Amino acid sequence: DPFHYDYQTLRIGGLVFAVVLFSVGILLILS
Amino acid sequence: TEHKMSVEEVCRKYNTDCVQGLTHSKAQEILARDGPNALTPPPTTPEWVKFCRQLFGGFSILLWIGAILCFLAYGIQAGTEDDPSGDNLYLGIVLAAVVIITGCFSYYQEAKSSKIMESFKNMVPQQALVIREGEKMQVNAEEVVVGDLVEIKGGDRVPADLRIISAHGCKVDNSSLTGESEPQTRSPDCTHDNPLETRNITFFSTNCVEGTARGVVVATGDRTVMGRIATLASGLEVGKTPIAIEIEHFIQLITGVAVFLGVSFFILSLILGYTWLEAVIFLIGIIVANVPAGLLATVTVCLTLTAKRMARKNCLVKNLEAVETLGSTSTICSDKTGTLTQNRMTVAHMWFDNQIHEADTTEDQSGTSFDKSSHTWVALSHIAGLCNRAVFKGGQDNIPVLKRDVAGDASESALLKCIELSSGSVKLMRERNKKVAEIPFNSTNKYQLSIHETEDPNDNRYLLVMKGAPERILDRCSTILLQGKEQPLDEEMKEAFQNAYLELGGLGERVLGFCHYYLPEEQFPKGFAFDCDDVNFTTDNLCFVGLMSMIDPPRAAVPDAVGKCRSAGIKVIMVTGDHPITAKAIAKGVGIISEGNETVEDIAARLNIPVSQVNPRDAKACVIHGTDLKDFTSEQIDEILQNHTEIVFARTSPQQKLIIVEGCQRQGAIVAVTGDGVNDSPALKKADIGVAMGIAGSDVSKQAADMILLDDNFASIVTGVEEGRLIFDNLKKSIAYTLTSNIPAITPFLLFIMANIPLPLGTITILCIALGTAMVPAISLAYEAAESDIMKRQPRNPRTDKLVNERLISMAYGQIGMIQALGGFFSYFVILAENGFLPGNLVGIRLNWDDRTVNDLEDSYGQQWTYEQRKVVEFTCHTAFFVSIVVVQWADLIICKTRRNSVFQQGMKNKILIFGLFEETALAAFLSYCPGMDVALRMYPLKPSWWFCAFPYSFLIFVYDEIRKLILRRNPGGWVEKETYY
Amino acid sequence: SEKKEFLGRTGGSWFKILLFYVIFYGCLAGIFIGTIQVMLLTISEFKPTYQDRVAPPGLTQIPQIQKTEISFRPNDPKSYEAYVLNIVRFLEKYKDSAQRDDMIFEDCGDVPSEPKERGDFNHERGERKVCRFKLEWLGNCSGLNDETYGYKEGKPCIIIKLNRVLGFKPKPPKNESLETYPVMKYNPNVLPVQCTGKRDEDKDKVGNVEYFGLGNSPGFPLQYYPYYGKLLQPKYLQPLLAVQFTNLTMDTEIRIECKAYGENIGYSEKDRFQGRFDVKIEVKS
């Protein structure tokens, strides 16, 4: 299907992934 | 030196009048003739050039050369056929910006370290009591000139070098030139042929203790003894530190791997048929991608962390590279007064009742040191309190008893400190019993008497308490006080007393005995006139109570530290300027010389033969007087340093300190000296690292060192040596981890040019992988601990085991880097084939792929692409390569956590390493998913299924290194350990 | 220096290192080849697994020009020899002798017909029959067309094509009185194509644009679509459209851009060759 693949949505998922990992790392170093 | 000259000769030599002094007319004109009376100012500080000498250092040379080459390539490309690609200019600007950014950070961490010493050095007394025209003047010491007679009272510092002509019991505490805590008397007579050890001259900036001495100046300003011995700028500043030598080897012999690899592929482009100008562009590109722009900003931060950690232990470090030089430290050097000993004398032993009650510096009388309940001890304390003529300074009740300055004789100072520690406030005891009469203290009598009453209010029996060495009082003493019962002259008790005495003067100690004879009331009534000049007491017929020992003890933490240093493979050598007996005794007490090791003197005394008769090599430990060093050639010094073992030098002048330090350095060893006085300054300047005390250190040796101990605890030096070994290991591991990410940055361009396939990795992505995700892991690799054998490890040989060797380069460039590049290329093929370009169709397509006009490039399946769409696919392949490199770097770092122990065995106890992994992945995800940046940093989002493409390669590399480490552990000394263990 | 014949080049004997490296690299090549092959096993050979990066196809022009500017002198044949040579080289595939019946090609409706498909993408059917497109449609030059005869009757006829995309059937717009206002155009089976550039600003009506193709409508006939694959439809003949400018002024620099309208055809700012198409024409006398 030549239509767009989940764009404007995959960016949300990637940003959520990055934020989750950054927060987990900060929590681990702090604690 | 003109100390042998008579007083009359000196007076005419400097025109000085031996009584009138120097007239005002002569002094005024001669002041400007010979300059002011101050030390020459230190060498000019290049405030603006020092910063520019930090960003041109050993490692920054590579980046500056790399930055210049990048601009050359872009300038070449613009000149030839129009290439809008500024990828060789974007790299060039950011390459230089790394040097400048890290140059400022290095300077800020160094200028601040030099901003503390400014407050350390502040003292401007500048006062003197000189006689001009026969009148005394409290004039400032800055104008003191040669040719006037000066007067010194007690408690003030000297104005300059003097020729003492008239002294009345004047004792001067040098502790800086001769290295003597004991204040020696000053007399107009001659003592030795060496003016340093003479008795009729006084040295610069040596504060007096007691007595008034009149002397004529001889040398003032920069020409005095302190003027020249403390003005040696020597040669180069500590030459090259061990860490800086490793960097110079890491550059000049591992930039060849860039030149060879670049050149070996430069001719390949010519063989293929590329143009002359394009070939050099390939060579410049491949030779500059080999320099990592994440190693200068990691090594500098890695060393900063260690210094910050050592700053918490009050180990102030001057040079940023001075952390490592204490690591290797093949041999160490020390002193005596100031460094090993507290420069103050305290009680050490009290011999009575046929027993030795060794005084304990420990604050609890550890190991049943003395019997504190016996009446003899109480009587000894009372005699000590009465006989003391010193006074504790008021307003000091809030300070530790041993760390408070007092006024009086040094022996009386030790006595007062001991009495205060034992009982309490000595002033109450002193005021309880009123004084009646006193006797003078001088070298002519060598025995001091004192008249005092009794503690009990009733039966005030008159007693003449006395102090003096029993070797001259035994003929003046008849009976003995022993716990109430009196022991007269006999061949048993007196022989036991002599036996106890014998092992008290053999410890380099001046025994000060205690005597007190009770004058009877039948012949000496209450109202008996007491005259100091007249004879009214009984010199003989005295009795003995106890003995005291005034030897200055070594520091509390020095014996354990010296023992750990010796057990750590470091040879400890003692150099000082004291009499050989005291220095040898102090060394034996500290532990510098092993217990039971007999020197050549003891061997000679064993069979009563001259020391020449016994073969020199028989005795391992030897002590050599300083007067033989001037008659010792370089070969003799080398042979004694090599053939023998741990040794002690005595009566060594600072020039001899320089000689021995240079001789020890000549034999391919790294020498660290731990001096504290002013006479150790040249040695600290020349030694590979100079550790100097801060609380009691001098004013010019403190500033001429590399590390300064604020706490003055010697154990900090063994902490520093362990930290140096640990930081060397961590730096090696971090360098390996930074270097292994080079092949996945060179191979893409190689395949893009040689195989003619679309570019797998761009230039901005290389900068991102070098500065954003390979930095925090590289720093965090230096926070880890080492294997449990870091203390017993033999010192590293600075000529066999380097920071970077062929093994590390092979490991980074042949296996690990190849696996990383393979994973990246697999991801690239995956993502360029999921869109239409099958792997078999990519060969020989770069010429049409990069063409702007060709907008109908047919792929494997058949459909055609325009330029922009295929460029978008190429850029998302770039992001895929970046993500794959990050995923592989996960395992790359996990397997680089250790060198021998496996990951499971050592354990992942590092709390910053996991944060490093998670921050790495978070930056990789955010930088490849943030909207609106694909137009600037050129990264497009990728499908979620493409994150997992690099997992098998990470698993494979982790398994491979686990197997390798198991092989290394199971077969020590094998082929794998020989050829792989970097 | 690295000596020889006495003890060896840095010791060595150079067998353990060489053997270890060669076996390690052999194993690495093996695992790489295995990974590539197992990857290849998960993708099809008839349709791509992803097609989103291929936007609505770009309308690239067939005359290949380096500086995207057609500059030539009509008097001198050598000035425009390369252009006509490239055009004839490209169009030699479209000649009537190359197109033949009997499962080599197929007969197709003269009028623009519906985009008839051939079936599924599976391999149960061999090479599906493809349409035909001779050069008889291109013409209107008061004579034979050849490809680029070479006279000065305006300019050498440039002809434009749509980038073939797998399994793609374009949809013409379907409404009344849209933003496009042509003289004659019906919604089905033709994608309207307009050639206007910098109008009312600098062009000021330099020349007249004449399009001739199939069905007299300015567009690509839909009966040719959709593509099925090089492995499935070899020698596929994509529809072509030809344009000619007759009263084009000489010694004048003008910018003309041709674009194709469509419901499913998209336009982009960064991509200057997607959907729309920009070209420069310069003629000197």
Numbering used by the authors:
A (entry chain G): 28 to 58
B (entry chain A): 32 to 1013
C (entry chain B): 19 to 303
Text of the article:
By utilizing energy from the hydrolysis of a single ATP, the Na+/K+-ATPase pumps three Na+ ions out and two K+ ions into the cell in each transport cycle. In this work, we focused on structural and functional characterization of the human α3 Na+/K+-ATPase that comprises α3, β1 and FXYD6.
To trap Na+/K+-ATPase in its non-occluded states, we substituted the four cation-binding residues (E324, E776, D801 and D805) of the α3 into alanine to completely diminish the affinities of Na+ and K+ binding. The structure of the exoplasmic side-open human α3 is nearly identical to that of the pig kidney α1 Na+/K+-ATPase (r.m.s.d. ~ 0.9 Å) stabilized in the E2P conformation by BeF3− bound to the Aspartate 366 residues of the P domain. In the exoplasmic side-open state, the A domain tilts ~7o along the vertical axis in the presence of BeF3− relative to that of the K+-occluded state. Along with the conformational change of the A domain, the M1–M2 and M3–M4E helices rotate ~15 o and 14o, respectively horizontally as a whole rigid body in the K+-occluded compared to those in the exoplasmic side-open states. In the exoplasmic side-open state, the rotation of M4E distances V319 from L798 of M6 helix (12.6 Å Cα–Cα distance) and thereby creates an open K+ entry pathway along M4E and M6 helices. Our structural insights of the human α3 Na+/K+-ATPase in its exoplasmic-side open state re-emphasizes the rearrangement of the M4E20 relative to the M6 helix to open the ion pathway toward the exoplasm.
